[PDB]
Design an enzyme around this catalytic site. Structure first.
Site, PDB file in Angstrom:
ATOM      1  N   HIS A  51       0.842  -1.197   0.000  1.00 16.42           N
ATOM      2  CA  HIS A  51       0.000   0.000   0.000  1.00 16.42           C
ATOM      3  C   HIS A  51       0.880   1.251   0.000  1.00 16.42           C
ATOM      4  O   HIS A  51       1.322   1.684   1.050  1.00 16.42           O
ATOM      5  CB  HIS A  51      -0.942   0.002   1.209  1.00 16.42           C
ATOM      6  CG  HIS A  51      -1.689  -1.273   1.382  1.00 16.42           C
ATOM      7  ND1 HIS A  51      -1.367  -2.184   2.371  1.00 16.42           N
ATOM      8  CD2 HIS A  51      -2.709  -1.806   0.675  1.00 16.42           C
ATOM      9  CE1 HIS A  51      -2.176  -3.217   2.272  1.00 16.42           C
ATOM     10  NE2 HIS A  51      -3.012  -3.006   1.236  1.00 16.42           N
ATOM     11  N   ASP A 237     -16.798  -3.937   9.545  1.00 18.46           N
ATOM     12  CA  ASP A 237     -17.208  -2.832   8.663  1.00 18.46           C
ATOM     13  C   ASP A 237     -18.283  -3.335   7.679  1.00 18.46           C
ATOM     14  O   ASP A 237     -19.025  -4.264   7.998  1.00 18.46           O
ATOM     15  CB  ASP A 237     -15.965  -2.240   8.001  1.00 18.46           C
ATOM     16  CG  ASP A 237     -15.502  -3.029   6.795  1.00 18.46           C
ATOM     17  OD1 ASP A 237     -15.519  -4.269   6.874  1.00 18.46           O
ATOM     18  OD2 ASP A 237     -15.180  -2.392   5.772  1.00 18.46           O
TER      19      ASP A 237
END
Ligand SMILES: Nc1nc2[nH]cc(CN[C@H]3C=C[C@H](O)[C@@H]3O)c2c(=O)[nH]1
Length: 339
Positions: A51, A237
């Site tokens: 990332h 989530d």
């Protein structure tokens, strides 16, 4: 009173009317994860290494970076995929949560000290809109809520914590649970708690991912060495349920699938909402136990401690990389500050 997330999840999963954990799909995901176990996707290093928007350094700056992003780590979905918030940073293009990280890096590179509480404690709505500006016509969701939480969080960091999340980290004495507790007790917006069958349950999505991300950005070393890092659960989530339902680990009732296919908005604390989160959280605990056993049954010694944090990170990215393949089962929709 309060069940911790793992206990909360067990309780929910066991008394769930609309969401089902399928042992076959738990097995599948474990085996999909096994073939990847030696790669950077299930090592702590992959958080930085896969990332490019994540901070390189393991310093106070990076720690405060993780703080501001996990403080705002909620509700990035848009009504349509043709019509969403996009942010350009260094000539690349990010949507969803990554568009927040792009927005942060963009501000830092412009020279605005957005990761400093000295600044975001008094930042205006107009400034926040500015910093989070989209490059489409569509704004990031809940920008007003993102501003309010910044002001509240900055103030509390400046008053109680010398204006630095590194201080909160150090006070936790290499305990992930204590860091999670400190955070939940000190910063109101992190109080990800609700009801189920008349008991107080807890998820702590943002608080837990904040601890995981502190752990990741410091590479599991130093102030980010946590003896008890394996006690952190997945971060409940709207994407992780989607990708567990895609892979066959989670099953939804007719009525629930009905809502999901029509894009009907769930409310924070709705039973079905609570059931999805709790079942997802417990589901991952089960995939982790399966994987460890499979790794044992192939008489192996892993090169790193596999835990529920790393599986979550993996499965989230999978969500991101395989979005088109998951169309058939939508994510549940909600607008809240907690995820
Ligand atoms: N469950 C869950 N919810 C979430 N919201 C935002 C993130 C963002 N984390 C990023 C850092 C490493 C992960 O691989 C992911 O690319 C997230 C997650 O990694 N997991």
């Amino acid at each position: 009173g309060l069940l911790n997330p793992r206990e909360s999840s067990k309780f929910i999963a066991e008394n769930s009317r609309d969401v089902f954990i399928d042992s076959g799909g738990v097995r599948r995901v474990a085996e999909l994860l096994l073939a990847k176990a030696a790669g950077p996707e299930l090592r702590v290093e992959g958080w930085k290494a896969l990332h490019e928007l994540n901070p390189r350094a393991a310093d106070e700056a990076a720690v405060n970076w993780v703080f501001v992003t996990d403080t705002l780590n909620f509700s990035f979905w848009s009504e349509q995929d043709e019509h969403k918030c996009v942010v350009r940073y260094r000539g690349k293009t990010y949507s969803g949560y990554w568009s927040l990280c792009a927005a942060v890096n963009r501000a830092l590179d412009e020279g605005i000290p957005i990761t400093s509480a000295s600044y975001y404690a008094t930042v205006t709505l107009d400034q926040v809109r500015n910093i989070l500006r989209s490059d489409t016509d569509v704004s990031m969701p809940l920008v007003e809520e993102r501003h309010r939480i910044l002001n509240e969080t900055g103030k509390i960091l400046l008053e109680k914590f010398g204006g630095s999340f590194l201080n909160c980290v150090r006070e936790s004495e290499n305990s992930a649970q204590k860091l999670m507790h400190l955070v939940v007790e000190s910063f109101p917006s992190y109080r990800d708690v609700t009801l189920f069958e008349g008991k107080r349950v807890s998820f702590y999505k943002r608080a837990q991912i904040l601890v995981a991300d502190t752990w990741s950005v410091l590479e599991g070393k130093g102030d980010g060495c946590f003896k008890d890092i394996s006690s952190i659960t997945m971060f409940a989530d709207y994407r992780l349920p989607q990708v567990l339902a895609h892979l066959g680990a989670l099953k939804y009732s007719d009525d629930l699938l009905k809502k999901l296919l029509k894009g009907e908005m769930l409310s924070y604390g709705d039973r079905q909402e609570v059931e999805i989160r709790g079942c997802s959280l417990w589901c991952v605990e089960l995939i982790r136990d399966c994987l460890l056993e499979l790794i044992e049954q192939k008489g192996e010694k892993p090169n790193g401690e596999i835990n529920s944090i790393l599986l979550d990170y993996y499965l989230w990215d999978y969500a991101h990389d395989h979005r088109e393949d998951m169309k058939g089962i939508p994510f549940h929709r909600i607008r809240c500050i907690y995820y």
